[PDB]
Design a binder for these strands. Sequence first.
RNA 1: GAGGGAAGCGGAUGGGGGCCGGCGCGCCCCGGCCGUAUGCGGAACGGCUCUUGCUGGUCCGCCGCUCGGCUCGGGGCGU
RNA 2: GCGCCGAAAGGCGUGCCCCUCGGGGCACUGCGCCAACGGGCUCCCCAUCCGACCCGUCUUGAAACACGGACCAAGGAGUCUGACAUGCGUGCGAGUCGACGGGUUCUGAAACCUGGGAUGCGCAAGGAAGCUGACGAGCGGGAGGCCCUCACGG
RNA 3: GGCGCGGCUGCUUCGGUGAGCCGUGCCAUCGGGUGCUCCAAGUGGGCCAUUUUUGGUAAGCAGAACUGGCGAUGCG
RNA 4: GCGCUGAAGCGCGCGACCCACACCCGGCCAUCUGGGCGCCCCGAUGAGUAGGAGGGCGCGGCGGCCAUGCAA
RNA 5: UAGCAUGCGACGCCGCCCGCCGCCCGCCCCCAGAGGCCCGUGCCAUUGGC
Lengths: 73, 133, 163, 219
Amino acid sequence: VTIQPSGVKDAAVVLSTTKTKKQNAPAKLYHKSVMRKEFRKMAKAVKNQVSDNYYRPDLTKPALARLSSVYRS
Amino acid sequence: MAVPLLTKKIVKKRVKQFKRPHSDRYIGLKTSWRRPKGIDSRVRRKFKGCTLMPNIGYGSDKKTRHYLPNKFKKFVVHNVSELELLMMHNRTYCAEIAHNVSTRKRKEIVERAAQLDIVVTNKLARLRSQEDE
Amino acid sequence: MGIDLVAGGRNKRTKRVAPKSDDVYLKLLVKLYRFLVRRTKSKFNAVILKRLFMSKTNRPPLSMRRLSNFMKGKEEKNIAVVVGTITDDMRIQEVPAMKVTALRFTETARARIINAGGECLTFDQLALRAPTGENTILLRGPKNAREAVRHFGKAPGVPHSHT
Amino acid sequence: MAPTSKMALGIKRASRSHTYHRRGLWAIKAKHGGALPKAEKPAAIAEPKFYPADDVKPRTVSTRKPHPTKLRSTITPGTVLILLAGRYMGKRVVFLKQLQSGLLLITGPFKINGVPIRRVNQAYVIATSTKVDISKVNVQKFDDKYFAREKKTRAKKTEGELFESDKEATKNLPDFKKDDQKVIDAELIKAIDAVPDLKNYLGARFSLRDGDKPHEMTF
RNA sequence: GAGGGAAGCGGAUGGGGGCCGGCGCGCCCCGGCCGUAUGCGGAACGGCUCUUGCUGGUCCGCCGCUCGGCUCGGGGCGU
RNA sequence: GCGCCGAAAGGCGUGCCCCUCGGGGCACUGCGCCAACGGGCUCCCCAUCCGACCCGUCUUGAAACACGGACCAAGGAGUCUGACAUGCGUGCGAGUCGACGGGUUCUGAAACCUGGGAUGCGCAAGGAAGCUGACGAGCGGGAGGCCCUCACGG
RNA sequence: GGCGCGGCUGCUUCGGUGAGCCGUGCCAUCGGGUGCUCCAAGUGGGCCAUUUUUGGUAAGCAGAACUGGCGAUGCG
RNA sequence: GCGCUGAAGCGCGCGACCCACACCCGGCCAUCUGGGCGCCCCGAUGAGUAGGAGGGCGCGGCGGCCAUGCAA
RNA sequence: UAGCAUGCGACGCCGCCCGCCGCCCGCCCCCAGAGGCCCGUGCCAUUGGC
């Protein structure tokens, strides 16, 4: 379930990441994209600034890394 | 910490094994434990050699509770979806594939789990669908 | 060991979140008080909490009359804390003002107090704007009143002498 | 109580001195405690961990305290150990392990063709002049590089150094053989001569390493 | 499993035998891939305001201009 | 632990004072946080104890020479709702309370709107029966605010 | 709890007194072993020991008192 | 019980020992003291028939949610 | 009278035995009113003159 934002791991381009929020009653956003391990850190450290507490977003970085490792071989 | 707590339930036990009393001398009379109900009962009298009765103090340490002896926490996995959560745990948790899940289904879970880096019970059971020594 | 100490295990255990509060909105309110209570000066909110857990033998109707004589301007129109509910039973042209706070009011009581003065406040808006809970009168019961203490059973029950 | 009174009687006193040397240098050890230290890439996770530093430093010290002390109760050097008896000169062994006192493992090298090693309740050992800081622990059985010969030439130098003392000292030579025969052992007389070490100990230290890790052993 | 010389609520408690399921780190060289800053071009966001507006996103498409890194394996070393 | 020597342990800043010998106690910033080496369970037997069967019941007291069972699988006991009294909870709250009809879908169901049956228990009572029928007060303990004056406190 | 001030009252001579009441001010070896309300239980047949008994030759009797235990309490 | 006798009887003194689940100590389970952030922590008492009071396990069919199945 | 199952003796002793030994694989683990190998290599253990 939602709070006001979510952040749910998947994606299926070979090499992929997922970085969702949700915000506001109509807009109903949810983006998925990226490759690289650096760009994985960065646009979740920025997400931390605009939200809070390191440990969960940080964890949902190698979940993705392991998925983008797996989709190689 | 954990290692010691795991060892305090597993190598001590308690394995008396609480069997119903005199279950052995009638076959039908079932193994499942029943409280010795009536006054003369020696077990009821809560004697030693009489086999201990169940009470709360007998209980394991919480830190060691519902763990496999491996000390991994088992999580039952119906399908691939449960796998995501398990993957997060990885180190913490072991995945156990339900008996029901079918042979055609079982394959996808197994491979996904490895990629997840949650090798546990599942490997054993997949060689168990293959045949084998 | 002692026997004293066993009797010491036999004190209470009053303790209760009530079996259900089916209202979720009451159900959240009743928790809020243990976070806020040890985190402010508010003894009153800590009392309301016990009395909105435990019982129906405890939950109060308060009439507009039973506010009305009893608030009477000499603790000068403070905030009146009614744990359970207000009920509509008086006509005087009622209260001299008033900020009344309760779990529930009837709609007639809501209408009559706000057209006399002040506000019929809800307890949560009270917790927000009066978090200290001081200048406040805990007013009151009942189930403790005339009808019914032990006056049960059929035709009762009596002063007593016999029953 | 007699050792333990001495510790008290500042409190700290040297540890009140310690600060000072930093105070003397100039103005300091608040800034350096707060401002430092490292960090920031990394991979994953909580970083719950660990070691080197500060606790470890009392645990090594603490572990050093039986270690003299058990020798004060039982008297001697430490390891490395020589056959007194047997062959007049001959060769050198190190006490890697106690099954017990008495049942002991005495050691060496073997990497190509090799060398034995014995576990004994005895046969032939009295100690020398070296000390380490272990008691009598290391083992399984490992060593090797030059060292049937080196350990052994290290033996010759100790066997010369000993053989002269065995001439000066003994009751004679025949029950230095009964002393060597014993090998529990121990208390009575220990410290004769054999001066100095500096090589003997360096050699012993290598021997301990060699009966440790990481060579010849890994798959 | 055990046995034709030693005593019994048939269990308990201890021990042997018999049976069985399970089984990484630091550095360097080669191969591989990609890159941001800035200019372009497209786009969810945000603090907030709440008629409305101002500053602040991030990634992608993909060329230019500097200047670098990662990952799967292999080879050595140290842990 | 946070400078140096010293393998090691240990000392190396300085002031005070007692002893006035060896020495002693006493005083003087913050901050951070180990070594070595390479299994479960079933049945049996021996030791040891429960041990007095169990078990359940009856009983002051059960191994019981008190009662009941050959052994097992399956069956085999707080049900139904009314009244009267309650506990716990929730909606409205000096009334609340809805059948039956009709209106209308799905459904043999049922639902929803609505007149609102039915007129309880209430809203105040007494008593054979006439018939009658106010609500003001504190006192004490002891919730809590204010005045103050704030160490207390009245 | 004690005192004073002030009103009202009583019983017992158109007689003597306090007490009561209200109002107002003043001054004063333990340690939760604990109160109240609703609803429910087996009962509503005991035993023994110790102490004190009464009957009875006595009794592993009968029948009380005061208490600790068994019942419903393991373990040594 | 074997069974002792200037004791393995008896009495008067005495020394050292043994021996419970007691008491201590270590670690842990309920309730309660409470405390602090749906969760963690400090200490105490803590046998049990009749039995009250409270939390939970399992059965079978129903509904909404949510899956599993050619090997249930 | 009974009585080798007190875990006994003797006499008489025989489709392949068993008498005496090479080489290997399991169980318990002194007498005694104080006492119980000459020259050597070799850390060892092996191994040689005697």
